[PDB]
């Protein structure tokens with residue numbers, strides 16, 4: 001059903017847990033990096049431009 | 052129909068002159084409408100008091116040097132530009148500096164008058180050397196709104212006044228710096244809402260909270276004609 | 280030491296197009312009010328729009344009626360634009376019933392007291408058969424901003440009737456807004472400016488009421504903002 | 510790429526603009542001057558910096 | 560300290576057994592045999608263990624010495 | 636339509652078979668969103684029984700990629716048309732011309748790094764008007780085979796499902812045409828024979844206590860894929876020869 | 885020929901016009917190229933890729 005309570009629990013679990021982002025041609029060790037996730041609307045992943 | 056009014060407006064004043072203000076949650080898009088309205092009115096149209104003109108008894112042009120003052124006339128002009136004066140009743144007053152001897156001529160050395168208050172008695176103005184150390188000047192303080200550069204007065208100064216009358220940029224608005232950041236903030240289910248971070252540094256005379264408050268007051272008062 | 284802007288002549292060039300002027304504006308607030316008003320006008324002006332449509336012989340948007348040329352989907356798209364002014368109630372159910380060959384325009388809608396059809400000439404559909412007859416019920420609500428079909432499902436409330444056809448609600452009558460700050464040299468004064476707000480709408484909100492409503496909303500937000508309870 | 514363009518534009522100098530030869534008491538005042546439209550974002554100037 | 564672990568590496572120069580020490584501490588916290596030595600900021604036990612390592616309050620020596628201390632206490 | 640074309644777009648549109656083109660030009664007698672009926676000119680009329688030409692159009696059928704392929708009539712009652720005129724516009728076609736996409740007002744400038752790289756920023760105004768909204772017609776298939784444990788059935792009786800989910804099925808167990816569904820919803824009710832549960836002891840205890848008679852039938856109904864929501868536009872039923880068709884069939 | 889046709893429309897012959905920043909209301913320096921381009925929505929839809 002996914003009511004507000006589920007979103008609060010998800011927010012609390014996600015807080016300090018980091019996730020790994022990878023791009024199919026991992027040329028060097030920086031092809032895999034870990035980031036702290038921020039929940040957002042939409043179906044697209046937003047990554048910081050500089051990296 | 053029915054709008055959303057913001058709650059939880061916390062203000063952490065690090066360094067009494069520096070105040071950060073957080074404001075949420077606001078309907079979509081109003082972050083920038085209020086940030087900009089506030090900034091523009093606050094910065095450009097704010098009643099204040101400031102030094103406008105200066106007279107040195109000794110020199111005819113602002114690029115010459117006076118004997119025994121290490122700082123050039125430019126430096127003393129800039130030191131006077133920053134000087135924060137708050138007058139209660141009178142609109143324009145003429146302050147005099149007469150100092151002698153070795154050491155730093157500071158704002159404290161101004162003649163202590165009734166209606167004029169110097170918020171920083173220890174603000175450095177000039178450094179005077181030894182054994183000659185003669186400094187005399189007349190600084191004019193006037194009240195006005197906003198920022199007026201010297202170049203427009205010198206342009207429109209058809210009333211020619213005698214030599215030595217060195218114009219300085221009049222910084223009336225007591226707000227030295229202001230900016231607003233808009234950031235994503237969601238009210239438990241609506242994500243299309245925003246947070247306003249207002250960082251403001253003023254120059255002592257007015258406390259930041261009062262600056263914000265009177266700015267918004269005057270804007271609303273202008274708006275007064277239409278609000279039903 | 281300030282002045283204040285008073286609403287002076289408010290000319291209407293066309294039924295949709297109107298220019299509203301504010302004469303005694305102090306230097307520097309021309310742009311501030313121009314922009315603030317523009318923003319509020321475009322974003323928050325409450326308007327009316329069709330929310331849902333029920334046609335009898337049609338289960339879903341994709342089928343087709345005998346004797347009409349537009350598809351059901353095109354009839355929905357045409358109804359989305361229907362500009363209507365409702366005074367008292369929030370939810371009106373208009374009934375359109377026409378037969379025979381001819382273009383069924385909005386004027387054929389059964390005229391209720393409280394509803395004003397701004398442009399009765401607006402076309403809806405084209406019949407092509409002597410005996411072809413369409414009947415429908417259009418449910419029109421009041422609302423502000425933009426709500427799509429898919430979000431409104433939250434309030435489903437037993438949508439059981441398969442005949443109900445949801446339409447995206449563009450609940451906003453203001454189409455376009457521009458402002459011009461021009462020096463309004465009054466014979467006794469130094470630095471005053473005039474605001475000329477040119478606004479184009481679908482012909483639902485009258486200009487004066489629009490400007491007033493915007494000023495109201497901005498004033499309320501500034502009310503909350505001036506007081507600071509740390 | 511975009512960043513570098515922005516910074517290049519911001520820092521680049523121009524022969525003549527608004528506020529040629531003004532003396533500003535600090536960077537915050539510089540920013541106040543630019544945001545008020547009393548000076549172009551790039552124009553040669555004498556500034557006090559610590 | 561969920562930005563840069565530089566101070567923990569300045570405390571422990573290996574930069575690898577750091578993660579093992581932090582894991583031992585944070586698992587000692589998860590299975591509630593112990594309690595946090597730092598006021599929590601709604602953080603999880605990972606960054607809590609990092610914060611405990613970086614301030615010099617906890618390292619390998621304090622874990623082993625205090626562990627055998629509590630063990631010998633629990634012997635009775 | 637393209638504002639800036641090359642002239643070839645009419646050749647491309649006509650030459651494809653998606654447009655409907657007049658074979659003997661004449662006058663359009665009857666126009667409907669399903670057929671265009673045209674009376675041929677006396678000139679081109681074959682001597683023995685020429686009569687009129689009727690063009691049946693194709694309405695939303697599923698394309699190989701699941702996109703919509705529907706033709707809309709262009710001309711109106713009483714329009715005179717010539718041999719080789721464009722009667723009905725195919726998908727992505729306007730008045731005979733190729734209209735692959737749509738033309739928008741673009742401004743070349745950096746807007747706070749939201750178009751940093753080749754990414755594109757877009758205004759709510761385009762979505763408001765629904766000008767880039769696509770229709771996709773997906774196909775789903777529920778097949779009832781006969782296992783050696785017993786033939787499966789399509790009945791609506793689905794063990795331990797809430798009747799809220801059943802509400803949208805007829806007595807035959809097939810969604811009503813035009814019902815709006817969402818991911819997870821049941822489209823075709825189907826049950827499969829399965830026995831020898833071999834429940835674990837504790838389950839035996841629970842069955843004893845509460846009286847939970849275990850139903851020997853597994854659930855199989857064809858539910859909608861995750862995150863898809865639309866209207867059931869059409870249904871087809873194929874029964875093998877021999878079996879007794881059901882009410883809906 | 886484009887210049888001519890643009891003149892027939894009563895539009896700036898250089899094809900750039902000054903734009904005002906919709907958030908703040910300030911004008912942009914250096915007018916920017918605006919105009920209509922024909923764009924396409926490709927079959928690579930995020931709805932499927934996620």
Ligand SMILES: Nc1nc2c(ncn2[C@@H]2O[C@H](COP(=O)(O)OP(=O)(O)O)[C@@H](OP(=O)(O)OP(=O)(O)O)[C@H]2O)c(=O)[nH]1
Nearest residue numbers: 015016560561562563564565566600601602606609610613
């Ligand atoms: N990249 C970047 N980081 C910023 C910026 N401003 C603040 N930070 C860092 O982000 C963290 C802020 O987190 P908090 O203020 O504690 O609030 P939180 O609950 O969301 O984590 C701080 O690091 P921290 O995890 O708290 O480190 P530490 O001080 O605990 O060791 C801070 O140093 C910034 O402008 N850019």
